[PDB]
């Protein structure tokens, strides 16, 4: 086979790498972890060091008491035995309160109560991560993209699981904490507002997912393609454009009738990401609250 | 016009039909012989859409729609007017699909460079033909393919989708979607991160690609690499692509019930 | 315009096309504006204007890159226009992969090493590398490297890796006469006894661009080693 450089011929390995240090507080950096020789033929195979700081250890006890607030509830579900548990872990559901309790903690911890202490633990794992995601950039002096981009799929599940809810009136219009429930839940949610593929926030969001497909596919290939002239070092093609950057942009220019840069092509790729989870929450934040209806609400409007 | 930099990769050859018989640009597109098939058969296949729009009566383009033959006429051809302009118009997409995905072929050989970008190409093109031909002809009628309309084409996926309960449960389905989301948030996250680098701080100069791997090691302990993230990125997308068309060659074919039951496999073991 | 619902998918649409057009004109900071095959400007540029100038820092003292600004190859091109119409192929008015056109091209990069994070030469022989060394995989150094004509060009006397990414991105070979040539890692097959270059025969190794040092590679020596690498797909191709 020519060579397609999708898995590592050669493995090197020097010192373990530390990182930059910049203004990261090194304290809260582990050791480093095993070199993964099966992760190498295709990445890093250096596991760690992580960051640890007070945001980090919030966020992870925070969650791991979400999965324990449903793990317990999975356990009651099956009567207490590994058996069932085992069997069904996919079927155990932990539901909101039903719409009679409406936005009040009131719900008792089995019929709604035990969710709305999940979803807190939830709410507080999840925003200690974002600010995780801009601390991480700040101390290495770099760019508030991540955090940004991530705040656009928070944007999506805090509309589902709070914002939209609250908006209804009930806590019972969020999502439920289960495998096959949640799907259940999404199914329902179509049906209930009059087919979601006529939300036309829905028919966007999935422009940008299937767009978010189209365009990685084509930028790995691109990359892939003129790895063979340090395509993949984007930075430094960036600050001092190459050959790699040069038959990229030819390749699609002569191909499609225009192109991008090596920075450009980053900013087309965050913002068809970023816009799924955007329009995506549009949508699902306007059902139910303004239009109940989807495809009635499409048909006069035109 | 070209790139400013463009004129000296400008040179002959790399052509896998005709020589240097199409071996010229027009504007900024390169022809080759698959450049004229693709036009071929984009134009036909557009023209005959033209006219399925006369017979429909509309020219409102959210209203026009192609539809494939019905589905008594099983595998065979058809009227124009009766799923026949879809039959056709099928062929000139696959003819354009497969010519646009050579024309790259000969764009890398003049340019130098590998050839997976139409690699890629070729998963969607089977995804389409997975949908208009593998899927159909297994299951013995045209008419199991989708219209050709704006609309009319997702009334086709929820009529398919109710027809198996809750497409949810589909397990090849499933794993589709984990790759399509793991892609969208790979691609968010790789955009983020080469523009976060070379857009730093104020008053910082560009970071480097070690910044890039110790942010996501401060992150999530892990940084796939430079490398690594082109390759996670082609596979994501691709392997998406892939068990989409697994789902959707395993329905109506192999599986023929309500997708919620293929589950107790597993709840119902003794 | 008619509920909040149609407002905010009117508002979007607008939204997305100014996107489009920003997303656009930052995508034109290299190669624009467009110029004819003489070099002149043209006439339509599109509807979408050039970006206003930005500028980035480099580290380690290199300076600033300002774009988009004039541009210029920075070096002859060999070529020469065939048709006064345009949109035919230029024709390469010497050896094309000696004179790096066409799919042997290279840019006239900066010839620095990149640096890394800590200023140190990111490219760099095992052999000056503190602590580097083979993890996985074929050790090729030692294997003789063989050409797409199936004859022997020299042998792997060390690895030129990418010291904070960790990865092997360059074979160096010695010839003949004694001297080495850098191989990019991409365009290699290493095997269990050999390492085949299907880009280059046996005797155009000699022809890959030398480098001023021993220890270190330039951003423009490593762009004339993989173009002229990559261009023996075609003009290498008698041979095959
Ligand atoms: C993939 C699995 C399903 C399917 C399920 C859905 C669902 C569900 C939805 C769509 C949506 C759309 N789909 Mg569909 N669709 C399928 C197959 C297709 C094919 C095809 C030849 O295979 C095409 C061309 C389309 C095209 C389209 C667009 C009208 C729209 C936005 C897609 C997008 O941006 O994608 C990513 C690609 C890009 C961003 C690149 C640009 C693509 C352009 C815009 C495609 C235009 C096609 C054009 C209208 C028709 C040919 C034009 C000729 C001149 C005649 N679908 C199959 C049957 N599709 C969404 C919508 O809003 O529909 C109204 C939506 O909600
Ligand atoms: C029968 C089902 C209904 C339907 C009902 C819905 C509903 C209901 C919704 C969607 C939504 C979406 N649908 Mg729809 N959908 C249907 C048919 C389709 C079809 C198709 C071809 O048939 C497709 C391709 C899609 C595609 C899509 C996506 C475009 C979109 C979700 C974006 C996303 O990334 O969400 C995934 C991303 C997120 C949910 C964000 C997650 C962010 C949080 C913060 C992550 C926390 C992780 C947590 C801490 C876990 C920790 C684990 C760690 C490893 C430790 N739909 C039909 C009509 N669809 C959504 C939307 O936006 O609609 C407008 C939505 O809510
Ligand atoms: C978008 C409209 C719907 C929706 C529709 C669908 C559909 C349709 C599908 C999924 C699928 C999944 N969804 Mg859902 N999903 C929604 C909102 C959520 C939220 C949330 C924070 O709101 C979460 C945590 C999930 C989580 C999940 C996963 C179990 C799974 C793969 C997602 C993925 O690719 O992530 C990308 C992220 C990563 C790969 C990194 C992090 C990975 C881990 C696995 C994230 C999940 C943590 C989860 C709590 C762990 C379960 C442990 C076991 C039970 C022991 N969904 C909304 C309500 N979702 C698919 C599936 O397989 O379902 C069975 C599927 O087919
Ligand atoms: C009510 C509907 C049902 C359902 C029924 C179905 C059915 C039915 C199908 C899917 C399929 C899919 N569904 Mg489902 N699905 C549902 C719920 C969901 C949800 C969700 C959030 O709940 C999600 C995320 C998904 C996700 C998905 C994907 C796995 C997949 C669509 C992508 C694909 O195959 O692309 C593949 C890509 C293509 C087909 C595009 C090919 C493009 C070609 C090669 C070239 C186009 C060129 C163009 C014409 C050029 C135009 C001009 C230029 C623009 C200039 N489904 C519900 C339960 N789902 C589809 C699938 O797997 O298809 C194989 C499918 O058929
Ligand atoms: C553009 C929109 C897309 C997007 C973007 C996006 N997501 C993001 C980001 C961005 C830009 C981040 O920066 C952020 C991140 O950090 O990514 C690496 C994140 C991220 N998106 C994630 C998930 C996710 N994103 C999704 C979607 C998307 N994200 C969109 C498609 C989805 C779905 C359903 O599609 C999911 C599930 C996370 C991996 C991460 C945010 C991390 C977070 O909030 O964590 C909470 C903290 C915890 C500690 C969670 C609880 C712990 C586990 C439940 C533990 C259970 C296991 C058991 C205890 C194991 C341990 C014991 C053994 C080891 C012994
Ligand atoms: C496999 C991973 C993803 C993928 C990859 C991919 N697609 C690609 C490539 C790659 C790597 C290309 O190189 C190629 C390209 O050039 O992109 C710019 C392409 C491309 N993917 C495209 C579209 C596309 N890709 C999609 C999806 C995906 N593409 C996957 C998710 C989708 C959807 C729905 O998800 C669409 C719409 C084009 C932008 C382009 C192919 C362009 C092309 O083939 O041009 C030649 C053909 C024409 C100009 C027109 C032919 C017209 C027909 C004769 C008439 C119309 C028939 C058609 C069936 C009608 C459909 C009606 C709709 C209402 C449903
Ligand atoms: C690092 O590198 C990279 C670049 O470069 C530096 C890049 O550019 C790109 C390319 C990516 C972009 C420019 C981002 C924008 C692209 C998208 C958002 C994806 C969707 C793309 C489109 C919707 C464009 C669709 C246009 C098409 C398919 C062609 C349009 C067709 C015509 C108008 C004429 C058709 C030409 C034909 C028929 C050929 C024959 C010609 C004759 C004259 C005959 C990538 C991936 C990249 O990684
Ligand atoms: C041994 C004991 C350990 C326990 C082991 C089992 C734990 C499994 C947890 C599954 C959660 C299901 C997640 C799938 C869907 C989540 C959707 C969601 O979060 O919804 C948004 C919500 O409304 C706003 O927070
Ligand atoms: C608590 C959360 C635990 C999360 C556990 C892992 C999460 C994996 C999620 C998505 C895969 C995409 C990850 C890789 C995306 C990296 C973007 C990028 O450019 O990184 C490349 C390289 O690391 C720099 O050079
Ligand atoms: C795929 C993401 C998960 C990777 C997380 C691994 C982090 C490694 C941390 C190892 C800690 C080393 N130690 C024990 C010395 O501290
Ligand atoms: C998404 C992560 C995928 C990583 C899995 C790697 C699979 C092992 C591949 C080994 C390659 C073998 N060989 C001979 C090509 O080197
Ligand atoms: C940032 C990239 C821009 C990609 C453009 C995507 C446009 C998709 C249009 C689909 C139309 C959906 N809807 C409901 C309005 O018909
Ligand atoms: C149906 C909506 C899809 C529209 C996307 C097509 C964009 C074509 C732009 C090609 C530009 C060609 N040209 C001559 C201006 O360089
Ligand atoms: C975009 C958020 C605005 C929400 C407006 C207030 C929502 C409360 C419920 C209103 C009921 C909507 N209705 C009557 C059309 O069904
Ligand atoms: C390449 C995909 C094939 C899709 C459909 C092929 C069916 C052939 C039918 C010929 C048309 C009959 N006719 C001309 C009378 O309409
Ligand atoms: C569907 C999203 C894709 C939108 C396509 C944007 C078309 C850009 C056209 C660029 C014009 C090329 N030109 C003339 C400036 O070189
Ligand atoms: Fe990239």
């Known amino acids: 086979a020519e060579y397609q450089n999708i898995f590592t011929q050669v493995q090197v390995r020097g010192p373990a790498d530390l990182g930059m240090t910049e203004d990261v507080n090194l304290a809260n950096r582990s050791g480093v972890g095993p070199f993964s020789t099966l992760l190498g033929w295709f990445g890093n195979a250096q596991l760690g060091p992580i960051y640890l700081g007070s945001l980090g250890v919030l966020s992870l006890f925070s969650g791991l008491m979400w999965f324990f607030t449903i793990g317990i509830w999975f356990w009651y579900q099956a009567g207490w035995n590994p058996a069932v548990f085992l069997r069904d872990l996919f079927f155990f559901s932990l539901e909101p309160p039903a719409p009679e309790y409406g936005l009040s903690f009131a719900a008792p911890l089995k019929e709604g109560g035990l969710w709305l202490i999940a979803s807190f633990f939830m709410f507080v794992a999840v925003w200690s991560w974002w600010g995780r995601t801009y601390l991480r950039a700040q101390a290495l002096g770099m760019g508030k993209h991540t955090a940004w981009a991530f705040l656009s799929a928070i944007w999506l599940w805090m509309v589902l699981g709070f914002i939209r809810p609250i908006l209804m009136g009930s806590w019972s219009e969020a999502v439920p904490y289960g495998i096959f429930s949640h799907l259940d839940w999404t199914n329902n949610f179509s049906l209930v507002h009059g087919n979601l593929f006529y939300n036309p926030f829905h028919g966007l969001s999935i422009a940008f997912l299937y767009g978010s497909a189209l365009l990685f596919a084509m930028h790995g290939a691109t990359i892939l393609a003129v790895s063979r002239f340090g395509g993949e070092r984007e930075l430094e093609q960036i600050a001092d454009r190459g050959t790699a950057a040069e038959r990229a942009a030819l390749f699609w220019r002569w191909t499609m009738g225009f192109n991008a840069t090596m920075e450009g092509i980053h900013r087309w790729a965050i913002w068809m990401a970023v816009l799924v989870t955007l329009t995506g929450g549009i949508g699902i934040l306007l059902s139910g609250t303004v239009v109940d209806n989807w495809y009635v609400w499409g048909q006069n409007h035109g | 016009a070209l790139l400013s930099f463009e004129r000296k990769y400008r040179v002959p050859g790399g052509t896998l039909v005709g020589g240097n018989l199409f071996d010229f640009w027009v504007g900024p597109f390169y022809v080759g012989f698959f450049g004229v098939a693709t036009f071929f058969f984009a134009a036909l296949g557009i023209i005959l859409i033209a006219w399925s729009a006369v017979l429909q009566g509309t020219w409102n383009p959210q209203l026009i729609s192609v539809y494939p033959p019905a589905l008594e006429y099983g595998l065979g051809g058809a009227p124009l007017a009766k799923g026949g302009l879809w039959q056709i118009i099928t062929i000139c997409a696959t003819g354009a699909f497969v010519s646009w995905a050579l024309r790259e072929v000969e764009i890398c050989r003049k340019l130098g460079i590998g050839y997976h970008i139409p690699f890629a190409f070729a998963f969607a093109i089977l995804a389409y033909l997975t949908l208009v031909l593998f899927r159909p002809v297994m299951m013995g009628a045209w008419g199991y393919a989708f219209p050709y309309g704006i609309w009319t084409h997702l009334d086709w996926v929820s009529n398919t989708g109710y027809t198996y309960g809750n497409f949810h449960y589909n397990p090849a389905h499933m794993i589709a979607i984990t790759f399509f989301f793991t892609n969208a948030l790979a691609l968010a996250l790789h955009g983020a991160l080469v523009l976060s680098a070379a857009n730093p701080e104020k008053g910082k100069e560009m970071r480097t690609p070690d910044h890039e791997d110790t942010f996501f090691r401060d992150l999530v302990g892990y940084s796939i690499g430079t490398l690594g993230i082109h390759r996670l990125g082609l596979l994501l997308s691709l392997s998406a692509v892939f068990f989409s068309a697994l789902c959707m060659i395993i329905t109506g074919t192999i599986w023929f019930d309500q997708w919620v039951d293929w589950w107790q496999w597993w709840v119902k073991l003794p | ?240």
Not at chain 3, 4 to 24: N, P
Not at chain 3, 137 to 150: A, F, H, S, T
Not at chain 3, 171 to 195: A, F, I, Y
Not at chain 3, 199 to 207: C, E, K, R
């Open chain 3, 1 to 240: 315009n008619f509920d909040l619902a149609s407002l905010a998918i009117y508002s979007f649409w607008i939204f997305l096309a100014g996107l489009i057009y920003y997303l656009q004109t930052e995508n034109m900071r290299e190669g624009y504006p467009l110029e004819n095959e003489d070099g002149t400007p043209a006439a339509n540029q599109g509807p979408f204007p050039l970006p206003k100038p930005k500028t980035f820092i480099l580290p380690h003292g290199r300076g600033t890159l300002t774009v988009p600004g004039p541009e210029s190859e920075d070096r002859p091109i060999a070529l020469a226009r065939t048709a006064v119409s345009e949109g035919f192929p230029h024709a390469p008015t010497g050896d094309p992969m000696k004179d790096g056109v066409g799919p042997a091209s290279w840019v006239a990069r900066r010839d620095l090493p990149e640096l890394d994070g800590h200023g140190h030469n990111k490219i760099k022989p095992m052999k000056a590398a503190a602590g580097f060394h083979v993890s996985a995989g074929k050790n090729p150094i030692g294997l003789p490297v063989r050409g797409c004509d199936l004859e022997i060009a020299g042998k792997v006397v060390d690895i030129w890796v990418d010291i904070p990414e960790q990865m092997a991105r360059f074979l160096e070979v010695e010839l003949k006469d004694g001297s080495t040539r850098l191989l990019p890692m991409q365009m290699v097959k290493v095997q269990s006894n050999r390492v085949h270059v299907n880009a280059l025969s046996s005797d155009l190794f000699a022809g890959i661009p030398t480098i001023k040092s021993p220890t270190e590679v330039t951003l423009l020596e490593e762009d004339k080693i993989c173009g002229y690498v990559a261009g023996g797909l075609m003009y290498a191709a008698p041979k095959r």
